[PDB]
Design a protein around this motif. Structure first.
Motif: not given
Lengths: 241, 247
Positions: A128, A130-134, A149-152
């Protein structure tokens, strides 16, 4: 020779505070050789926090520093770093690991077992954030961290949340001038401002089965609705919650 | 040392594992505790089965699906069928005159519980009550007790004159009473907001038989904390993270 885990927990006064510290204390009571360094964002130690810590029986250190007119908890975590350096000598002997754990995250007991053997800096997935499940460090077949492994901003030096890493106390003592930057620092870059000074990507120690498991969750607690208290108040202000 | 049967309805959603994990971390400290976890699902989920097995706690894993129809709206409180399933299971497992020392507590998976709370409720003879934080739009709601040590009302703003103006997390029932009043269940449909607790309690006891706990109802030992929905906007429509990774 079981290393001591110094859990650094910044905190501040708000309705759900006692509840958060209570369920966190219930988690920490299971952890052997633990030192809870609680730093309140207040002009002085509050009795609510003093009494709760006192009654747990845990080995704690209660500090405080008020944030003036920057990420929440920054000055508090920084005060903890300074305390550690003023308390333990650079080339000390008593092994330790430092972990910055906010009072509202959820921690599994396995998380502490994983970070206790940290030689330099250890890392793991955090749910929960970076706007992700993880978010999770990217680890190759050799077991080395090679990315995130992130989006932001996946390219920042260390794209990982505060709850996703632990540092061997030795490094904190050696790099005596390294603190979290509160000055001109882009969002999500504060963790990097410290880690960059302490370790390099290839020296990170991946935990949680080479970062494939989630052992800590970035849970947020809803602000309670107190509308029925009115302007004058209904409940007894002297009753602590 | 009476056994405390903690009934916890639960359901699958992002924060479920975290909730159960921190709740388990608390319950692990409580001696003679039986965790009756009831999932809202057609079958026991691997996530919950695995978590319960690894805790080391004494538990019973049950399940009953709340009909999809019941969760829709163009009412029915969440967990109702699951709590009722636990009541039915206790009555089918323990003989009416079991005499087996036990207490029943309906604890949702997201509240915050202190260790002291369990020792306060463990000695319940009929029905015990205590203050609960963050309910009824107040810092806390608390039963009102007279000099004779009897509950005579409720310190609440929302309908303080209802039979039992108290939250699910504010009371515990002696198992014997549950077994004796075999027909008492939580109201399923048409439940007026804030009246479900009364629907069960009114069939179990009177105001005069309530046992005030938590320093005669002057202390807060349990909090009705609510967890915010996690923001998953960066997962996109195709998903970014691995769906096989259990969170």
């Amino acid at each position: 020779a079981l290393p001591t885990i110094h859990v650094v927990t910044p905190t501040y006064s708000r309705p759900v505070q006692k509840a958060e510290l209570t369920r966190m204390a219930n988690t920490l009571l299971h952890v052997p050789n633990l030192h809870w360094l609680v730093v309140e964002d207040a002009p002085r130690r509050t009795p609510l926090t003093a009494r709760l810590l006192r009654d747990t029986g845990l080995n704690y250190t209660h500090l405080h520093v008020e944030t003036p007119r920057i990420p929440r908890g920054t000055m508090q975590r920084n005060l903890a770093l300074r305390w550690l350096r003023e308390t333990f000598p650079r080339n000390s002997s008593q092994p330790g690991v430092v972990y910055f754990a906010d009072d509202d995250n959820t921690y599994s007991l396995e998380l502490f077992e994983e970070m206790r053997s940290t030689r330099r800096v250890s890392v793991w997935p955090v749910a929960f954030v970076g706007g992700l499940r993880y978010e999770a460090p990217r680890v190759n077949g050799a077991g080395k961290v090679v990315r995130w492994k992130t989006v932001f901003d996946p390219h920042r030096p260390f794209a990982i949340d505060m709850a996703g890493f632990a540092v061997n106390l030795r490094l904190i003592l050696q790099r005596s001038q390294a603190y979290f930057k509160l000055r001109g620092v882009k969002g999500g870059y504060q963790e990097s401002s410290l880690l960059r000074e302490l370790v390099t990507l290839n020296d990170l120690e991946p935990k949680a089965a080479n970062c494939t498991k989630i052992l800590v969750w970035h849970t947020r607690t809803e602000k309670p609705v107190l509308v029925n208290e009115g302007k004058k108040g209904f409940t007894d202000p002297s009753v602590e919650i």
